[PDB]
């Protein structure tokens, strides 16, 4: 029989692992090409340095991690453990973003 | 007495040029003066920062143009650029 970890045990293990390790969670090129297509709407002949994409990626993830922390706290506030899109919308509204 | 710098009368001429039938109270006048003053430091502070980042000593028309693009979002900016551009062309001519 398989070990069959209960739902939450591996999720907690990823929580412990990623909160002490500073490896970059989103991949470089899939995030890099997203910058190019976003900046293409503003400038067609535009270039980005390797550190320029690097600076954008860590800032975006730390904003997303901080948003996920506020999204998670809203779930326990709403008697839940699963994050919801309406929890995200509440997080942006309280922070004044949207 | 001492002359205190304010935009109390200049907001009034703007109001009549877009709406010649309404008035404005002093409390709303001070808020508009505060609004004009607060945006003034934000653009000038952004323009001062923009000149400092490029190692440039003067603030030109492009400095204000970049400052209002950074602060004013979206369609509100593009009219401010359009109104700003038409002001410089009229001033130079």
């Amino acid at each position: 029989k398989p070990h069959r970890y209960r739902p939450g045990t591996v999720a907690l293990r990823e929580i412990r692992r990623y909160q002490k390790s500073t490896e970059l969670l989103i991949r470089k090129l899939p995030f890099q090409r997203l910058v190019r297509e976003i900046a293409q709407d503003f400038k067609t002949d535009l270039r980005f340095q390797s550190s320029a994409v690097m600076a954008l990626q860590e800032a975006s993830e730390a904003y997303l991690v901080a948003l996920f922390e506020d999204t998670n706290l809203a779930a326990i506030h709403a008697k839940r453990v699963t994050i919801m899109p309406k929890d995200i919308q509440l997080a942006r509204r309280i922070r004044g973003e949207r | 007495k001492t002359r205190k710098e304010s935009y109390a009368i200049y907001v009034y001429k703007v109001l009549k040029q877009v709406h010649p039938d309404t008035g404005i109270s002093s409390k709303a006048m001070s808020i508009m003066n505060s609004f004009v003053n607060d945006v003034f430091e934000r653009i000038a502070g952004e323009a001062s920062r923009l000149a400092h980042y490029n190692k440039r000593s003067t603030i030109t028309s492009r400095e204000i143009q970049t400052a209002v693009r950074l602060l004013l979002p979206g369609e509100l900016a593009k009219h401010a650029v359009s109104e700003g551009t038409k002001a410089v062309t009229k001033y130079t001519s």
Binding site: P7, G8, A11, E14, I15, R17, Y18, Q19, L25, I26, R27, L29, P30, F31, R33, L34, V35, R36, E37, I38, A39, Q40, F42, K43, D45, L46, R47, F48, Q49, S51, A52, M54, A55, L56, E58, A59, S60, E61, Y63, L64, V65, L67, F68, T71, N72, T82, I83, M84, P85, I88, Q89, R92, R98 | L50, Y53, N54, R62, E63, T66, L70
Partner: protein, 79 residues
């Protein structure tokens, strides 16, 4: 360059929430997370575009992104 919003994959969004302490992730979270990431990127990169345009440069430097994030109260250390 099209359909690059899917480059932020589902495990990549999953790893972000695990860093944030999220235990359970809904299936509609990834689409919402992609939207708020697109909106956040459409502000910072556009701010860096105006910084790069004003600097008489055609390549966006990390230094321009530093002021772009700083002016919105999101200053980044280490560039």
């Amino acid at each position: 360059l099209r359909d690059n919003i899917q480059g932020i994959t589902k495990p990549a969004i999953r790893r972000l929430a695990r860093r944030g302490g999220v235990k359970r992730i809904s299936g509609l979270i990834y689409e919402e997370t992609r939207g708020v990431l697109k909106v956040f990127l459409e502000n910072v990169i556009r701010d860096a575009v105006t910084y790069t345009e004003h600097a008489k440069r055609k390549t966006v430097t990390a230094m321009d992104v530093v002021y772009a994030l700083k002016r919105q109260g999101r200053t980044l250390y280490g560039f």
